[PDB]
Amino acid sequence: AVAFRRQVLPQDALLVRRVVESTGFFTPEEADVAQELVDEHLMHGAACGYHFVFATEDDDMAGYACYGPTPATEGTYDLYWIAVAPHRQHSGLGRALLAEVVHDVRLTGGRLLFAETSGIRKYAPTRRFYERAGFSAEAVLKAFYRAGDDKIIYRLEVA
Amino acid sequence: AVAFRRQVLPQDALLVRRVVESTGFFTPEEADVAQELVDEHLMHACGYHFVFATEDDDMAGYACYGPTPATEGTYDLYWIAVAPHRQHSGLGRALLAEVVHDVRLTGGRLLFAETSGIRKYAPTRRFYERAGFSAEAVLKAFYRAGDDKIIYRLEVA
């Protein structure tokens, strides 16, 4: 039984870091960012503009999604990432976490949810995930991250 | 007698707001944001840089830009604003040239700029187009219903 929680607790910053570290898609610098967002929500609240949906089983965090409203826009949101622990990864939890983010974005009047990823081979699964969830590749910024590493911007119309 | 400066002084937060106010293009809250960025630089480092254009004791214009997080050599041009008495005199292009020079010197590769596709932003669009930027992406209805975001790309090296 997976439970979805939106309230950020003090235990979360480190639990998120461990989730992020278990996936292999986060360099230490990226895992630092992942944890910092949880801490800023603890040191401010909703004010930081970072929202979370944590998937838990017992006292363990199976995975989570991080998202927020896009600055200077009306009804546009960014999905920062969905991270699931390796042992809960072929469980449909990723799609469940995205469904919850979409529910939340719809409730606050959102029209769009954007996700950005890399165009390299390693990110092929992530792109499939987004495409299977109904996101459409709307923009490609060539060599955005580095030579040969393009940024692909995926769009999901929510309303 | 135009000079270029990059050290953020306490006095600049208000001068920048005034450059933004002088144009008559932005809301008082948009001017608030511009002033806030200058102030946030003074208190930090904060991820962005400035190039101020000045004629005598007055700020004629400025540019605000910074490195794109999580990229190697990608930069974002946040804002370039020139006062009405500096408009159409090439100060905007000159400020953009300074940003591009500073970005190239830090080993930068790309400079992106973003604007709206609404009627009011046509001059901004033309300015970037005239400067060598190419429209690489359009995210439809991005800022609000019917207001698309155009992402402009400038290869600097």
Side-chain angles (χ1 to χ4, degrees), chain A residues 1-10 12-17 19-35 37-39 41-42 44-57 61-87 89-120 122-127 129-131 133-159, chain B residues 1-6 8-10 12-35 37-38 41-42 44-56 58-85 89-92 94-103 105-118 120-125 127-129 131-157:
Chain A
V2 176
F4 296 106
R5 173 167 50 79
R6 279 69 173 174
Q7 189 181 35
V8 179
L9 306 177
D12 297 335
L14 199 65
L15 291 165
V16 159
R17 195 190 181 87
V19 168
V20 155
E21 289 181 339
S22 73
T23 72
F25 280 76
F26 289 76
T27 58
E29 189 174 354
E30 295 169 351
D32 293 327
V33 175
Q35 182 179 359
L37 297 178
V38 177
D39 292 327
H41 187 105
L42 284 167
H44 303 291
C48 68
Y50 300 118
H51 298 260
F52 298 89
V53 178
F54 305 106
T56 58
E57 304 184 36
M61 184 179 292
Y64 83 117
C66 181
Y67 74 95
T70 307
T73 78
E74 166 271 287
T76 297
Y77 289 76
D78 285 295
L79 178 61
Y80 304 127
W81 51 77
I82 297 179
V84 169
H87 76 282
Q89 203 155 23
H90 286 289
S91 180
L93 183 61
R95 34 183 269 261
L97 282 161
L98 175 63
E100 298 309 314
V101 165
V102 168
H103 164 273
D104 296 355
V105 165
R106 282 172 171 167
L107 273 50
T108 58
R111 305 172 300 104
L112 296 167
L113 180 59
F114 288 97
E116 303 184 331
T117 193
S118 167
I120 69 180
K122 177 187 182 183
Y123 289 87
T126 302
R127 294 193 299 281
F129 177 79
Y130 295 143
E131 290 170 3
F135 284 80
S136 64
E138 186 175 28
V140 180
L141 304 185
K142 298 296 294 175
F144 183 90
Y145 302 107
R146 58 186 56 73
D149 193 342
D150 302 345
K151 183 165 71 169
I152 298 64
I153 305 174
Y154 282 100
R155 181 201 183 81
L156 184 71
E157 297 183 11
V158 142
Chain B
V2 171
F4 295 99
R5 173 173 51 78
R6 298 174 175 78
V8 179
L9 300 177
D12 302 326
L14 192 61
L15 288 171
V16 165
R17 184 190 171 84
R18 287 174 178 176
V19 168
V20 170
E21 286 174 0
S22 71
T23 67
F25 186 91
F26 304 93
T27 71
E29 293 65 42
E30 288 165 349
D32 284 311
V33 169
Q35 180 177 35
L37 290 196
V38 172
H41 193 282
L42 296 161
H44 291 264
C46 60
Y48 48 75
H49 308 286
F50 294 94
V51 182
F52 305 101
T54 70
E55 289 174 344
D56 297 312
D58 305 344
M59 184 177 288
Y62 75 114
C64 183
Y65 76 99
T68 303
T71 64
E72 291 180 355
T74 293
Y75 291 78
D76 290 300
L77 176 59
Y78 303 125
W79 209 318
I80 299 183
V82 302
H85 59 81
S89 184
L91 179 51
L95 283 161
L96 174 62
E98 296 303 302
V99 169
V100 172
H101 168 85
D102 294 358
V103 167
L105 289 177
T106 315
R109 305 179 303 99
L110 289 162
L111 181 63
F112 289 92
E114 288 177 346
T115 200
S116 170
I118 71 181
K120 170 182 176 182
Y121 289 90
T124 300
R125 293 196 301 280
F127 172 82
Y128 297 135
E129 290 170 0
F133 285 81
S134 67
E136 191 169 22
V138 179
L139 302 178
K140 303 295 294 187
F142 182 92
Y143 296 101
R144 51 180 171 171
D147 194 339
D148 300 348
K149 180 170 68 172
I150 300 65
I151 306 182
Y152 282 96
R153 181 202 186 82
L154 182 70
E155 294 187 358
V156 300

